[PDB]
Amino acid sequence: SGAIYVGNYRVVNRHLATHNDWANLVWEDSSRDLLVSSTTAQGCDTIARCDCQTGVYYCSSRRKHYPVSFSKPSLIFVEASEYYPARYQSHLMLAVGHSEPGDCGGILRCQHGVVGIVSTGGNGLVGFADVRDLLWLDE
Ligand SMILES: Cc1ccc2c(ccn2CC(=O)N2CCC[C@H](C(N)=O)C2)c1
Ligand SMILES: [Zn+2]
Known part of the structure; x- marks a missing residue:
C-alpha cells in the first residue's frame, strides 16, 4: 500500500484504488497501473x-x-x-x-x-x- 499526496491530488496504484478514489476520480490509466483522485487537504x-x-x-x-x-x-x-x-x-x-x-x-x-x-x-x-x-x- 501507499500513495503520493501533491497539491489537491492523491496518486495511487490503480489496482489498489478505493471506492472513495473512484468517486473523486481525476484521471486513470490501466496501461500504467495509475489512478489520481482529488483531495480536500493540501498534500505533503x-x-x-x-x-x-x-x-x-x-x-x-x-x-x-x-x-x-x-x-x-x-x-x-x-x-x-x-x-x-x-x-x-x-x-x-x-x-x-x-x-x-x-x-x-x-x-x-x-x-x-x-x-x-x-x-x-x-x-x-x-x-x-x-x-x-x-x-x-x-x-
Ligand atoms: C515474486 C513476485 C511476484 C509478484 C509480485 C512481486 C511484487 C509485486 N508483485 C505483484 C505484481 O507484480 N503484480 C500484481 C498486482 C498488479 C501488478 C501490475 N502492475 O500489473 C502486477 C513479487
Ligand atoms: Zn532526479
Missing part, C-alpha cells in the same frame, strides 16, 4: 522533473529503504494477475531489488523529489510506475 509531497536513473525506494516487506539503479520508463510485458490480464504496462521502470505484492505503493525518490511508486515485482526485481511526466500534478 514534491514531484521530481528530471531524468535520474538512481534513487531510493521504500520496501514495506522489509520496513526499509533501498538504493536502486532503474531503467528509463518503457513498455514492459507483465504476466496476468487477479487484477489485470497479461499485457504491456507502459511508463514502467525496472530495477534489481526486493519486492512482494503488498509492496505496491512504496515511493521511489531521487534528490529532486518523488519519481514514482512500486507497481510490479519479480524474483529479485522491482518495477516502478513513473509519475515525472504528469506535469499537471503541480500545475
